Symmetry: C6
Amino acid sequence: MKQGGQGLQDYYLNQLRKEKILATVFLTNGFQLRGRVVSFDNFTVLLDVEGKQQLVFKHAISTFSPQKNVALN
Amino acid sequence: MKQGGQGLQDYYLNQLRKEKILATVFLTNGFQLRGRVVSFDNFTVLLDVEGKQQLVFKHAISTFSPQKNVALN
Amino acid sequence: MKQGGQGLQDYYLNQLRKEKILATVFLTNGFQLRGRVVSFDNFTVLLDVEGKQQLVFKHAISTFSPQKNVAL
Amino acid sequence: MKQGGQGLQDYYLNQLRKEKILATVFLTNGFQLRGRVVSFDNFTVLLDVEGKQQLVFKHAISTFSPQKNVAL
Amino acid sequence: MKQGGQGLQDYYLNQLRKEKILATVFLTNGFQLRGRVVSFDNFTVLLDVEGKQQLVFKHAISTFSPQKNVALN
Amino acid sequence: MKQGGQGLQDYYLNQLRKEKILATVFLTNGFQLRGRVVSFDNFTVLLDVEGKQQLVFKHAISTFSPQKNVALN
């Protein structure tokens, strides 16, 4: 029921997506977006930032920092 | 069909290309490009910048920030 | 029971997680977080920084620096 | 005759190479080279900059910007 | 035996570890560490820095600069 | 007689190694080494810089700039 090795990632981002939890996404270049997850695959995260879409490549992402903790397993 | 975990990225860039949406492409090094997606594969995105082609590697791309939102399913 | 080639990484992070060792996580951009390891996979590490969760991509991590050494 | 997923990249670099199009190659660290494509594989591009060879890693390349557009 | 195209890296770090050679590890972000290789896998290198362990990801390492040369075959 | 997709790379670095051609190796962090190739695998290049070994990860390398052009195919 998952791809081996990315259970934390897929579960976590999927919880952020379902609940639409606001999060600060720190990028590797040090820039940052404060928005919500619309969608994601293995390489990209589609983000809702103040009503505007932002397609962010995962390799550019440093950290997801949610405003509310996600329930774990 | 041929897919894997990259439905989101492919669909999205394909929508930007087909709808000729103007997008700002923020690269990880800080540089930016305003243009349109002519084409793309798994590693590169061909952009149209004022009639001038620009071949951009996806590993160097941070975010795609479109002028208009893409209709998702 | 084991993916070859990542025994050091997996064992080491699993120990910091079980032993609740406080660690400074240096990111490749010079940012750093001081917290504990809650979970991890092949790409991400979930961190506990003063009560708040921090999902960190491993490709962005530069160094784990624990407060207490891990037994090997 | 074709590795799926890299048709744009391979075709495009092959055209710059055959047509000897002068191109500015932006590297991810802000460096740039102005020369022509001699050869390439899945990881490297061999460049001709004013008579001198420059073996450039593709993971370090940010953008190819040709003097003349490639026909698609 | 288990190998692939990584004979050079494995042999070398293994020689540094077995011979307890002091090496400066330059990371891509500019930071440096003087210490010894305790252990390593395909992605990480465990270092000893003044009795303090430091888990370093190989993708963030630029160069290993040893205090003494390693005998190669 | 090779691994598909890295013929230019393996041939080129092997020519630099056999002839011991001096080259400036530009790293992605903008630092640089002027030396000769002792060995290489798929991930690392062992470098001779003024008689001192430098194990450089390939992912940190930006450019090899030889003092003498390598004969091609």
